[PDB]
Amino acid sequence: AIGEFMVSLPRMVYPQPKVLTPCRKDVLVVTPWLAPIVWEGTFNIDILNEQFRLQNTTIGLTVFAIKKYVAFLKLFLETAEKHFMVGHRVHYYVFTDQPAAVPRVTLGTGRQLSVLEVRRWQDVSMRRMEMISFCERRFLSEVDYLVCVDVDMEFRDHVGVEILTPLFGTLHPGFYGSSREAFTYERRPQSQAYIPKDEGDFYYLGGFFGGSVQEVQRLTRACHQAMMVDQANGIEAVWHDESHLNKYLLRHKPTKVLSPEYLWDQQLLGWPAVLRKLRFTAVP
């Protein structure tokens, strides 16, 4: 559940937060609209696990595995079992054109997997946003939060309830140090995804976003509608649904932002000092 009567935390023994000692001095840990930016060292996972377990939180994880991308599911799911929301209730939703190619992955207790079969490049571009906004009633009934990720990835370290919030995006690992003018937003005013050179907070990834079911459905519905307008006007945004996600999150600020720990490519970008953990990474 979300927002329900919250029982008292038990007694806990942990290090005292010190007001005149930052957790991290090397990075921005809060946005200018007072959303936490989630980095290692900023959260006590024991406190957060208590809070979310006391709400009996259920997390849905959506992933699309189409055509040859079904080959990525085994490592994706095996590593999710090791690292993603361990101890919490998890429902995986695997959207695929090949239900029989989904690997039989052994799940921990309190975790389940559903295989959802799905059916022009234009409809392929819009499929993720459309499908998340077909699954509307199901997600509302089954999970509290939705996390929407790409399949050609593996978990390497903890990804847990520290990410959960009404609406989150993830800082793209290519652009977290860039000035806004260099962001690869859609720049043509004819597109619904258009962002001028003097606007923008961050460049968020299409491959890792989420929130409450309600907020995720609002985002995916808005992006799908904007993509349909663009299609009608004969324009395709430079980075497809990621361009629309960026426009949405500019105008509807996320309530947490995940640091690039949460989606990194070690082959392309190495392992910078500022990343204490690489939690979820591109498969080479």
From Swiss-Prot:
State the free-text cofactor note. Binds 1 Mn(2+) ion per subunit.
Alphabetically, which GO biological process terms does the record hold? carbohydrate metabolic process; lipid glycosylation; protein glycosylation
* Variant or mutagenesis effect after changing G207A: In allele Bw08
Key words, A-Z: Blood group antigen, Glycoprotein, Glycosyltransferase, Golgi apparatus, Manganese, Membrane, Metal-binding, Secreted, Signal-anchor, Transferase, Transmembrane, Transmembrane helix
- Enzyme Commission code: 2.4.1.40, 2.4.1.37
Cofactor(s) this protein requires? Mn(2+)
**Pathway connected to this protein:** Protein modification; protein glycosylation
MF terms (GO), sorted A to Z: antigen binding; fucosylgalactoside 3-alpha-galactosyltransferase activity; glycoprotein-fucosylgalactoside alpha-N-acetylgalactosaminyltransferase activity; manganese ion binding; nucleotide binding
Q: Where is the signal peptide?
A: none
Q: Which residues bind Mn(2+)?
A: D150, D152
Binding, UDP-N-acetyl-alpha-D-galactosamine: F64, A65, I66, Y69, D150, V151, D152
Residue positions the entry lists as glycosylated: N56
Which residues does the entry place in the Lumenal compartment? 7-284
As for what it does, the entry says: This protein is the basis of the ABO blood group system. The histo-blood group ABO involves three carbohydrate antigens: A, B, and H. A, B, and AB individuals express a glycosyltransferase activity that converts the H antigen to the A antigen (by addition of UDP-GalNAc) or to the B antigen (by addition of UDP-Gal), whereas O individuals lack such activity.
According to its record, what is known about the domains? The conserved DXD motif is involved in cofactor binding. The manganese ion interacts with the beta-phosphate group of UDP and may also have a role in catalysis.
Could you tell me what this protein is called?
Histo-blood group ABO system transferase
